[model samples]
Target chain A: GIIRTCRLGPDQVKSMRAALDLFGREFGDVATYSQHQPDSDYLGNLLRSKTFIALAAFDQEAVVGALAAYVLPKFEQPRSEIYIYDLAVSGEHRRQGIATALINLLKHEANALGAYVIYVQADYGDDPAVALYTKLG
Target chain B: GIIRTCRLGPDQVKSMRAALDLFGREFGDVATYSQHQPDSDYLGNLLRSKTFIALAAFDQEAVVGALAAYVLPKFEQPRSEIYIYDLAVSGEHRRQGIATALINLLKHEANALGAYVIYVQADYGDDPAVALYTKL
Candidate 1:
């Protein structure tokens, strides 16, 4: 399948909601990306924050993979760090390098936004996540 | 020695700087809290955010212990979560329950701010921190 990835903004609420649904299916209620559904107004304000980020991989307008993150500024430094809050790929899209492509795109976007580092955590027993993060690191 | 704990605001630059110094001494250059020093303007803006917390324990005017945190609002739930970005006690103040007091104070403050959960991470080798957090 040919995949296209892009950073989302307020105007992309429809696609953003699709990505949130994808996160809900993958990570469930434990993740912030899935627990609170953003209304239109809220999503708009969040997109405006410039610190919140949403990147999604689409196949024919359907979200097949997604990543959400927060840009946290350092207390002492002028630099900012990107925290990968949640990342997931649809079952059918697994093993296609979609996740890696999404993260690589995010890295480029992060640099453009002045972030020097990106940090993410994976559950101890989740091999795929561990492997993915290890590869990225 | 008596310890008094209080939450910091934008108006409390001196105390905030002291707490940041303590973080620098404790976590070193690797942590975001110690990577760069905040000037007055940046520190003031940070303190002005209601969701940003800087709780400190003081022996008179000196910062003995401190915790910096952020209240992250959930997207699927109305509640919030508190992420303890940095927590430290001065070398001289170690083993004095200052860290415990600061965390407990932060718990109360987090409750007041409508946060339901608090999260913190410790390095693999930090037994003291693991034990302390485990106790809490």
Candidate 2:
């Protein structure tokens, strides 16, 4: 699979939804993701705002892994921090460094924005997530 | 105390930080929040993006309670849902309807935006949050 990041504009609502839907599925919560998808106006406003970040790992255009995040611009300084709100890989796609590729892409994205860091918290015993973060961090 | 929503622009970095700091303090994680606070450029970019939502309850100038959220615009419909990412009230301010007031204010904000609905998940048996979510 190949990893790619999204740069959404008001007109890229279709791509945004596709990325988020992929996140919903990989995170095992399509119901929640679909519960109240963003309306056209809301999507337009958010897409235009540019705080949201979406990255996907695709296998022939099928998103097998995804990362959805928010870039938090800090006040104390002039830099930004990228927060990994959610990251997941499909069951069939693990152990292939897809997660690493995604984070590497995030790293580049952070540098592109000159973001201070990329961070996320763990539940403290989940090896998959913990190991990945530990290995990457 | 009164609950209020913020519409932050590039110039409102100070206000946004104040609100987020309040949330961090109440969440008991100022260490994490302060670790890498957003820089001016990033703040400006994000503020310009308009995807972030911040609501704070004030006792005059002090933020006693705050709610930080991201408005997730969905693709399946023409509506959006408000996700309560982080919510907290000062230790001394609990049980005073401060949390409820903040959420009620958020409810109003949602309606104003014509958002689809407001939702959050909770760990089972966590009373303060679960009870509040259940009660409200």
Candidate 3:
């Protein structure tokens, strides 16, 4: 329902680490990642390989919304497959379609990359996600 | 090559437990399974449900071999598969086809059940499990 562009960048890793930490805090974990951290560097290298894609809705100075997808080689097929790793839309900017914009942008990327199919495992066991994907879809 | 089988009576559970305990004494905390009171009624139930098969080899009065396989349903394919869960042939019967006979027996069961595939993870890593499956 909205127009959004996507890009992969070094900052995307830092951004995702922040969002992941925020999500993890709800499960009682601290979020502290830096350029020198071992696990951070390991993940950073994987992200750098273009093995994953970051979908973002960008406003003037910041990322207004973001979602990331993890792609893996097909087990028995010739095409690639995707597992959505994580996604987050800014809490201050709900219902403006920022999240939807991010997903729509990713669909275009998947098509260009020769993905045969895409699937999302929606677990809206949470109140907000259940309400969002269900009504939005 | 050869077929060897060992039986488990009501009393052998104690020996099985002891074997399982000492089998790990030389290695560090590497027990395959513990809490072995022995001879589970679950064995007969699994056999009845076709989820498990157990057989023991005997030579006259001496116990010589044992093996168990599980019938796993591939829910995604609506087909059946066999996983060789455990197998052992006593040292006295080594180099005979006791292991091979156990495998063949399971292959027959799989064929009877309309299973097109039989799979097992070999105990010794260097063992040519791939070749065995390919030969079948």
The native-contact fractions of the candidates, in order shown, are 0.42, 0.36, 0.00
Write down the lDDT of every candidate, Cα atoms only: 0.76, 0.63, 0.49
A41, model 1: CA deviation in Å? 2.2
Ranking by DockQ: 1, 2, 3
Per-residue alpha-carbon lDDT of model 1 for B1-136, expressed as tens digits?
A: 8999999999997788888888877765446455467788988988898668999999977998999887765545456778776788888889999989989999999889988877764434243312111112
Off by over 4 Å in 3: A1-5, A18-40, A125-137, B1-136
The interface RMSD values of the models, given in order, are 7.8, 9.8, 21.7
Give per-residue CA lDDT, model 2, range B1-136, as digits (tens).
4544444567876666776777667666685565567676776666665345666677776677777655655444566667665677778878888778778887877788777677653424233312112112
Against the true structure, what is each candidate's TM-score? 0.84, 0.56, 0.40
Comparing 2 with 3 on DockQ, the higher-scoring candidate is 2
**Root mean square deviation (Cα) for candidate 3:** 20.2
When only the first chain is scored, the TM-scores of the models are 0.84, 0.74, 0.66
The best candidate by lDDT is 1
* lDDT, residue B76, model 1: 51
Positional deviation of residue B9's Cα in model 3 after best superposition, in angstroms = 42
Candidate No. with top TM-score: 1
Candidate 2 off by > 4 Å? A1-49, A58-64, A74-79, A85-94, A119-137, B1-50, B60-63, B74-79, B85-92, B117-136
lDDT of each residue in A1-137, candidate 1, tens digit only = 68999998889877888888898777654465555676778777666676788899999889999988777766656777677767889987899999898899999988899897787644353433121121132
Report DockQ per prediction, comma-separated: 0.37, 0.21, 0.02
Q: Which residue pairs in model 1 clash with each other?
A: A35-B76, A35-B77, A36-B75, A36-B76, A36-B77, A37-B75, A37-B76, A76-B36, A76-B37, A76-B38
True contacts kept of 2: 0.36
